[PDB]
Amino acid sequence: RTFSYTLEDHTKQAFGIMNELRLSQQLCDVTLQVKYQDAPAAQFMAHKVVLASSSPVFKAMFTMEVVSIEGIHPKVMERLIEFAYTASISMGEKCVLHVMNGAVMYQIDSVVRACSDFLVQ
Amino acid sequence: RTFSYTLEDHTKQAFGIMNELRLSQQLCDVTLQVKYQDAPAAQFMAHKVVLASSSPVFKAMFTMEVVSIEGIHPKVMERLIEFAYTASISMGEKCVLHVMNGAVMYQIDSVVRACSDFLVQ
């Protein structure tokens, strides 16, 4: 007989740690430079393999690097990265469209579907 | 008002992709050399930030590198890495103790508790 076991919460817990690591800027191997049209330049350190696992666009991009990002607002990028590491996203209603546009841009389909479904209303 | 959304399955899905990436040997930044006492040398490519998020011992170790691993059996290491990326682990009963010893060695407490609870019986 062969024993087997699954920890139901493991993925949620491992992501918690991965988020700590990003916040401590530990083990990061990418820096996203978001320069965008009158808004101040922002930088976001992250882990390539985590970004790739949430976005086909990031996966395509990566399969210490500094990446220039045009065409998306830093605050929008910030929220998408948070989603990549936390499985949740928040914005103030008067902006759920801007977020959606970022999520469309990065093929984060679950976020797109969420904003879209909410915007319809 | 501020909108918020959580994708319940995101962590399970992102890990699925991270596992694909490891299997395709994409974005890896560590190679674990497991040489152990009469057994053949084995190598395991992985992502530091994923190993770190499942093991305090790996986190301590990392906070393309080749790491020499002594004192643990390659097949045991293999199963622990699988657990790190899949949240599940399997072995053939006549070996759940060997696995437990590896899991103890790497402070993967949920695996230790699982084998321990099963061994008691």
Ligand SMILES: *[C@H]1C(C#N)=C(O)[C@@H](C)[C@@H]2CCc3c(nn(C)c3-c3cccnc3)[C@@]12C
């Ligand atoms: C509006 C908002 C709210 N409420 C947010 O929660 C965040 C997510 C938005 C970031 C992007 C943004 C916002 N307000 N504006 C006017 C923009 C913007 C500006 C220029 C180009 N694209 C977007 C926020 C702050």
Ligand SMILES: *[C@H]1C(C#N)=C(O)[C@@H](C)[C@@H]2CCc3c(nn(C)c3-c3cccnc3)[C@@]12C
């Ligand atoms: C026994 C086993 C079963 N059934 C497994 O599923 C895997 C996880 C074991 C790997 C380690 C191992 C096993 N059998 N032996 C004798 C060892 C071993 C040998 C020497 C030192 N430590 C462990 C497996 C194959």
